[PDB]
Amino acid sequence: QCNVPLGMESGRIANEQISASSTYSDGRWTPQQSRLHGDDNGWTPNLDSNKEYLQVDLRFLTMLTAIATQGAISRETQNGYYVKSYKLEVSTNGEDWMVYRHGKNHKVFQANNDATEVVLNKLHAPLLTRFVRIRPQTWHSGIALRLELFGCRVTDAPCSNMLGMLSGLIADSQISASSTQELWSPSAARLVSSRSGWFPRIPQAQPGEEWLQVDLGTPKTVKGVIIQGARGGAVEARAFVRKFKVSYSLNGKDWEYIQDPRTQQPKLFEGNMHYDTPDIRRFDPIPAQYVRVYPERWSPAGIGMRLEVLGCDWT
């Protein structure tokens, strides 16, 4: 189930996780008043412009599937205010941001038409993230928001634990590659926790020729990967892998590929479309201690990537 309200109405998203670009100077429209169905006003910025935003830190990587909004009626005046359209901006870390797109350009979500009713927008393509910004583009009378976010934790699914790239339970010694450009730091390759990435010696490599390998420490059930791009960096190199294959092994010597049923050939998985926003790719459960990810296609900067492995212990 991944339509679950994530905590605005209920308080499970605490006051400290809600912030904004600004807030109205009388103090009666604070970001913390932006909870769906709240009975005291709503969030309003100090200026009404399309540069203002309401921000939520979900604290953990979370799949986002939908957004609900209302306007608000002023307790003090009885006047109504509502956002009519907005954009969505997301981030795993609070520094690197992606504006949500529909095709080649920004998605403009149609929002409210009065101060009282809830409008729900489903993401056409759901999204793995931590920080969420709602960016009003048009409004009636003034910007005012109440909000709920919907989705789930990746690890809610059966046998879908993060196996330790992000947490560090997998040590640097367990992480290796076909080549590296730097005495690189294996931690550079960790989902979300690294602010750079793994780059091979020649990032413009031959397809299927380079790889990143994770040793899980013991044999496990592997049921997916989470792939991310790389920020790199004096000059910052936003890179990502656009397609890839997966191999797996118990001995670290003999390798099998995850196969596509239709082609009867190794499966070519879709990778990322942005250097920060990760993508989860699940597959049927395989026994493995070692996993290899082979970039097949990549952005203009070349191969740069961060990785996590998903699964669970043998039962």
**Structural domain boundaries of the chain?**
1-155, 156-315
**Sequence letter at residue 150:** F
The strand pairing partners of 5, in sequence order, are 150
Calculate the alpha carbon distances from 11 to 72, 98, 129, 202 in Å: 19, 27, 20, 49
Residue 80 CA to residue 85 CA, distance in Å, equals 16
- Extract the tokens encoding 236: 């910052």
Q: Do domains 1-155 and 156-315 have the same CATH topology?
A: yes
Give the method used.
X-ray
- Give the resolution to one decimal, in Å: 2.0
Residue 121 CA to residue 136 CA, distance in Å, equals 14
Residue 305 CA to residue 62 CA, distance in Å, equals 20
Residue 9 CA to residue 81 CA, distance in Å, equals 19
Residue 300 CA to residue 315 CA, distance in Å, equals 43
- Which candidate, 187, 293, 228, places its Cα nearest to that of 93? 228
**Sequence letter at residue 190:** R
- Which candidate, 277, 207, 209, places its Cα nearest to that of 243? 207
Contact 111, 119 (CB under 8 A): yes
Q: Please tell me whether residue 194 adopts helix, strand or coil conformation.
A: coil
- Which candidate, 254, 242, 250, 231, places its Cα nearest to that of 281? 242
Residue 17 CA to residue 275 CA, distance in Å, equals 25
Which residue in this structure is represented by tokens 């790889």? 211
- Tell me the CB-side half-sphere exposure of residue 307, using CA atoms within 13 A: 29
Give the domain 1-155 fold. Jelly Rolls (2.60.120)
| CATH number for the domain formed by residue range(s) 156-315 | 2.60.120.260
Sequence-ordered list of residues with C-beta below 8 angstroms from that of 155, at least 6 positions apart, any chain: 161, 162
> Residue 248, Cα to own-chain centre: how many angstroms?
25
Calculate the alpha carbon distances from 252 to 113, 137, 150, 201, 291 in Å: 59, 53, 40, 22, 9
Residue 166 CA to residue 214 CA, distance in Å, equals 12
Strands (E) in 250-278, as ranges, are 256-257, 259-260, 265-266, 269-270
Strands 98-99 and 101-102: unpaired
Contact 41, 75 (CB under 8 A): yes
